[PDB]
Amino acid sequence: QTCYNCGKPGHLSSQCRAPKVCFKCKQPGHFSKQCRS
């Protein structure tokens, strides 16, 4: 995946707080109604 903040590839929920899908909470579908509305 790609970082929420570094803008780098090679990223995951353990490389940073979240991938670009989120920033912290990173649940499987929450972003479309909270973090990406």
35 binds Zn ion (CB under 5 A): yes
Q: Which of 12, 13, 25, 36 binds Zn ion (CB under 5 A)?
A: 25
Q: Which of 6, 12, 13, 36 binds Zn ion (CB under 5 A)?
A: 6
Number of residues that bind Zn ion (CB under 5 A): 6
Give me 10's structure tokens: 């090679």
| Beta carbon of residue 26, minimum distance to Zn ion (angstroms, whole number) | 6
12 binds Zn ion (CB under 5 A): no
Q: Is the dihedral of CA 9, 14, 17, 23 positive or negative?
A: positive
Q: Which amino acid is at 32?
A: S
Question: Rounded to whole angstroms, how far apart are CA atoms 2 and 21?
Answer: 9
